[PDB]
Amino acid sequence: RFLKVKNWETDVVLTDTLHLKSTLETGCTEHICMGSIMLPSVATKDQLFPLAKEFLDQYYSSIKRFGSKAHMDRLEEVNKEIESTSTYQLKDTELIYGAKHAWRNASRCVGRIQWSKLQVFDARDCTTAHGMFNYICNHVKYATNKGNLRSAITIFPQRTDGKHDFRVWNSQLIRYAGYKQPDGSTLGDPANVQFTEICIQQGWKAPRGRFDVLPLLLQANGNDPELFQIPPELVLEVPIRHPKFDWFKDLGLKWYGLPAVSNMLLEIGGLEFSACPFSGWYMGTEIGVRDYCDNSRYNILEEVAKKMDLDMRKTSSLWKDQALVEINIAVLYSFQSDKVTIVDHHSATESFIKHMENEYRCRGGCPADWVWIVPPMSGSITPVFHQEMLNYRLTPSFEYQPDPWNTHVWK
Amino acid sequence: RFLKVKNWETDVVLTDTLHLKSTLETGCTEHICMGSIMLPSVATKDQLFPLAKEFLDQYYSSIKRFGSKAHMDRLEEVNKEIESTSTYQLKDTELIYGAKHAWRNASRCVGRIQWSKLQVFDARDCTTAHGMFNYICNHVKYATNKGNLRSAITIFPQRTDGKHDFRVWNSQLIRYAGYKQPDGSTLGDPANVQFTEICIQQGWKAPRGRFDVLPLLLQANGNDPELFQIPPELVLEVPIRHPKFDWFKDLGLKWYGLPAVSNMLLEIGGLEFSACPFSGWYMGTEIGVRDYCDNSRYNILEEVAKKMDLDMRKTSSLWKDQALVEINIAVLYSFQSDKVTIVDHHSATESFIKHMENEYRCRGGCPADWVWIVPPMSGSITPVFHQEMLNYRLTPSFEYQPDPWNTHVWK
Ligand code: HEM
Ligand code: HEM
Ligand SMILES: N=C(Nc1ccc(CCNCc2cccc(NC(=N)c3ccco3)c2)cc1)c1ccco1
Ligand SMILES: N=C(Nc1ccc(CCNCc2cccc(NC(=N)c3ccco3)c2)cc1)c1ccco1
Ligand SMILES: C[C@H](O)[C@H](O)[C@H]1CNc2nc(N)[nH]c(=O)c2N1
């Protein structure tokens, strides 16, 4: 009832009791482990109050007035509003608490040492896609901060019935378009090919190039989504160069500075926020390794190896690995030379071990998903590879949710 | 009851029913995933017969005479011998079946495409440590095959009471010694420092250098273990050079060609083989990444970066990664130029995906441990990173077992 996780590079041992508070299920059983399954899988007023109570008990405990007067009043207050309205509404302070702890509890996030430095934008007063666009631009401007990136989340109105849902249809606020060609191959980002075509289906006019920043497709209160183009001056970009290889500029690559996922769902006290774009900053490998060198992505290991003068004949010449490291030196170098916030997989993973310590001390644990925490290159030369991690689901939390075009009733 | 695993780089989907036959437990629950815990945790005659029956049913099913005459006779035959002797004995064919399937079921093994090409050496007639030495030398000679390595296992007598146990005290038949210095630091291999000192405690005379091949410490039928030096002509070594950097020879590194774990425990039909050294061949990264560049191992990223002329000031210069790829090009290059069998993490992981296909088709599944299958460098540029894997425990199986010096009664 008090589990042990060990680091096999420092012999450090930490004891986990936080998993006790766990509640949601993981997909694993006693006889099958699903820790490498990518996605493992309206709400009534009965279910809603334990969840509100649970949440409120930790919120007041966190400001050191658990079970007190102001607590039991709010517990009663929310009880009454759930009877009356069949749902309820979070205080501004409760929303900011919930959000930050949804991030704190994100077991796949290696960035959580920053979880308490999160700027919460309350867009729960929003009613239209244009208001969403306006809130999102302000999010993008604020979080970017001229390259001194700041973490932020904008939280649109909670789901109510279910047919009234606020959704950002983009998977990230800033994404490069993907177009398939006549010869099957893909210009731009292959990951977004279907979304890029949804934007054209609803009206986008595509500059059919590479790094074309997609428009926002914004759905408000269940209505059909509408297209908006982020003012380009708000979309900060780092052109990627290499600190030794001047042919690297000729590759003509760039990436946006601001990673902001917008397709996820924030759960706080049983309430569901289907549109809650959050941004922080990139770890280099997300761009250099996955974005650039995934096969079903920009897939540039071919060209970079070529220009490097590489033995591409034999698999075992590690030409793929060799080009992979150069691409990531270039990503980091480029971003830092432009004073755009980026972290390398070594700093980020040491910080996560440091974060893990603090959590086990002042919280009794840290849910962590090794499969996702270990960076996609140079696994074992980073301290998280050697760190045992217990994965369990705590709430408040960020959840996967269906793509809104699979679920929506159009017209 | 029929689970789906997906490859997110090829969109290939495979369906797992093999996990049904699973029986042993994984450490995970519905509310906690332990897929990154490194080690998750006498036998009576009651327990022994279902296990024998279970095993025999799959063995006869595998030669296409399930439940037949020759089956029910052996089922009865083993039933009677378990009543009589309180244990039993495997046919030569049953031992070879069990062993190969213990390997087939090793979910952390990326090498299993070869599982049916395994040479089984029956050393169940062994009675003394000298016989163990002799069987082990023959294993080493055969498996090495002058560098055209062949997979093999030597199986010493099963555990009986528990105080009579055959054990190889080494963790691998061929390992480099580790000595701590006056100034705390370590010459040779730090991993083996305690074992290297156990060998001195029982009588070894250490050439206190780097790549000193340890002696065998062999325990027979529970008796105290005895030291033997593998004839050096049987210990094949690859001196590591780089195909471009002639200063790499100056590093003066070498590794043994033969990976043979000997500290594990083979379970077949409920019988327990506490001494069952198995060997195959190395994937490059085990040497180049873990052996050489683990912090608590040879830890040579320092010196290789230096000689490469590298920006070692800033963590984010990826100098660690850059030196890591060169070290692994050198390992592979060296081994292949010496006609010593080695596989690169790209060939090995593509083969495992290919292996995974065959298993899901002609077996209904393949237990796999993503945490261990993904190589310790260049994770996502290999196809196994993108392959969802279900981990579950099938039998026959290889199991972890206590180090014999923590459990043994000396004198
Ligand atoms: C501040 C700097 C941050 C860094 C360096 C960082 C880093 C990362 C990385 C590398 C991943 C893996 C994602 C992938 O491979 O696609 C991840 C996952 C995640 N991050 Fe963080 N992140 C940061 C901030 C945040 C913030 C501010 C939030 C929420 C408010 C957040 C929530 C999450 C969630 C929910 C996931 C898992 C999503 C999924 O399962 O796909 N992160 N993070
Ligand atoms: C034939 C070529 C083989 C290759 C390339 C290979 C590769 C690997 C690798 C890289 C690992 C991870 C081990 C580590 O990181 O320390 C592993 C694990 C393992 N292999 Fe294979 N292996 C081979 C043959 C075999 C054979 C012949 C057997 C048994 C008869 C076997 C049984 C196992 C077991 C039981 C594990 C897991 C051990 C543990 O959990 O520590 N392997 N293999
Ligand atoms: N579609 C695919 N699967 C698939 C792949 C990935 C996912 C989830 C991706 N989370 C994206 C994500 C999530 C969280 C953080 C970041 N990054 C940051 N720094 C960041 C953003 C905000 C703060 O920090 C990126 C879901 C499905 C696929 C892959 C290959 C072919 O297909
Ligand atoms: N002691 C530590 N933990 C720890 C680390 C590892 C283990 C298990 C290691 N299995 C070793 C192993 C197992 C199977 C295959 C290979 N390889 C092959 N090719 C091979 C051999 C035979 C056929 O193929 C290597 C157990 C405990 C540690 C790590 C860092 C500091 O401490
Ligand atoms: C199949 C596997 O679950 C999939 O590749 C996961 C593995 N780990 C990951 N880790 C991160 N950070 N991001 C990812 O997309 C993935 N993908």
Ligand SMILES: C[C@H](O)[C@H](O)[C@H]1CNc2nc(N)[nH]c(=O)c2N1
């Ligand atoms: C903590 C973690 O479980 C540990 O580092 C594991 C991770 N994956 C591994 N994978 C392999 N192949 N070998 C290992 O030693 C490990 N170590």
Ligand SMILES: [Zn+2]
């Ligand atoms: Zn699990």
